[PDB]
Amino acid sequence: RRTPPLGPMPNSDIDLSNLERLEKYRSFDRYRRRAEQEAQAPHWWRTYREYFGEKTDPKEKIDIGLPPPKVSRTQQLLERKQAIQELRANVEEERAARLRTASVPLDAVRAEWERTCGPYHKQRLAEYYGLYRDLFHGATFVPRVPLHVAYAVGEDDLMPVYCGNEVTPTEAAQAPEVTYEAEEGSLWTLLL
Amino acid sequence: SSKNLGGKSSGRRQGIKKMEGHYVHAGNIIATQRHFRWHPGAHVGVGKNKCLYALEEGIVRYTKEVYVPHPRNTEAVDLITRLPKGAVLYKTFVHVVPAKPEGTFKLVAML
């Protein structure tokens, strides 16, 4: 009573001969990465991603957002290469890297992240909380134009809202201040 | 003339008591045995005699996942490092999928 396997075996693509010539696992991190990469491949037997409920991940949704602008990637890449080459010529940066003491500004990197891959992180955080599942019922979009809203409570600080902040009702009793970049010739509709 | 002695052993009654499909509550022992045959997975704890018991109420499932040994166990460390580039283990794991929630919201008063 022996049944044939319903697919390729995980330890069948290699040969059992000439094992002394093959490169063995010299460390454990490589084996851990191999295991965590093989665990993501869809198998034909009973796996973990089947019984604990995955809400059917293999399912293409519908994008209802704005298309990305047409930007030449080769020009941006060569400009970034020239920039990092001009920055590498400095000796003070080398000394700061050798002395293990080199700090970077937070506002600049925050603005650059919001201008670049900001919308992608905002979309993934919105889909993590299940916003597109309850609002548009599966349909998702990407916020291209950035949005900035800050409440007004005391007299010096502020109460901002980002992608998952925490605002108390006592600090949101009045209408906040919404600020976003826009051109002269387009209307907007705010919904809360 | 009767040289052997001590071969009058008994059965340990070790085996699987709950198969896949039975409604197992919290605390029921899945299977007692020696040596790690069915490694625990989700909501399945262990003891001192290498036993298996459930932690939540639901349906017990038996799947086969990857086996990632602990770095402190040097025996498993060398057993893994002695493997060629592209060798996996894949042992049998026991999982308990929960069905009933751990609580809900209910109205009490109205002031």
């Binding site: 022996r2 396997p5 697919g7 075996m9 094992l19 002394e20 | 493997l83």
Partner: peptide, 18 residues
């Protein structure tokens, strides 16, 4: 199990010679 198609999946000593 021996009769199930997933038989012999946990074998590991056949890939080593030490």
């Amino acid at each position: 199990y021996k009769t199930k198609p997933t038989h012999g999946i946990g074998k590991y000593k056949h890939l080593i010679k030490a």
